[PDB]
């Protein structure tokens, strides 16, 4: 997983109206949320490098498959004036 | 019915609930066991954050389902 992969890639899942909700990745989703909320440099947000630095070593094969989708679940993506990619927690998860 | 709730530390607790219970009711039950006020709780289940007004049945939460408690940031 490279920074360009997380920030560029389009979504591959259908609208949430046609999807059935699954609990398979709740554990990972919560850990991702709590890190971005409390454990990054700024509360409620984390840069791409921060998230990668935290999780890239800890993900299994199946977790790697859905990691970007879980990130898009939790956060909106932003680019600063300096060009840094920042993921900010949606208000529903704050 | 009985459901499971993963607390802030990751340990699992047991709640006695009904399908007609609102998420607000569930958070109140969590307060009694964990001491966390409802206005500081958010519940996550099946990749979704649970809204207070809706019921457990609304999210198709069944017997022995596992909810996830997280601490409100703001």
Curated annotation (Swiss-Prot), chain B:
Residues modified as (Microbial infection) ADP-ribosylthreonine are 66
Q: Site annotation (Interacts with activating enzyme): which residues?
A: 54, 72
Q: Membrane topology per the record?
A: Peripheral membrane protein
Occurrences of domain Ubiquitin-like (ranges): 1-74
Q: What is the effect of changing residue 65 to D?
A: Phosphomimetic mutant that binds and activates PRKN
Residues under site feature: Essential for function: 68
Write the protein's name: Ubiquitin
Query: Species lineage, top-down?
Result: Eukaryota, Metazoa, Chordata, Craniata, Vertebrata
- What stretch of the parent protein is included here? 1 to 74 of 229
């Amino acid at each position: 997983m490279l920074p360009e992969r997380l920030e560029s890639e389009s979504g591959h899942l259908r609208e949430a109206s046609a999807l059935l909700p699954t609990t398979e990745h709740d554990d990972l989703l919560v850990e991702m949320r709590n890190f971005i909320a409390f454990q990054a440099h700024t509360d409620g947000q984390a840069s791409t490098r921060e998230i990668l630095q935290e999780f890239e070593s800890k993900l299994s094969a199946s977790q790697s498959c859905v990691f970007r989708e879980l990130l898009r679940n939790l956060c909106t993506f932003h680019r600063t004036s300096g060009g840094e990619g920042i993921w900010k927690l949606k208000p529903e998860y704050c | 019915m009985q459901i499971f709730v993963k607390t802030l530390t990751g340990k699992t607790i047991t709640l006695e609930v009904e399908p007609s219970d609102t998420i607000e009711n569930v958070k109140a039950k969590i307060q009694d066991k964990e001491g966390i006020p409802p206005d500081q709780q958010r519940l996550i289940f099946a990749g979704r954050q649970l809204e207070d007004g809706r019921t457990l049945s609304d999210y198709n939460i069944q017997k022995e389902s596992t909810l996830h408690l997280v601490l409100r940031l703001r």
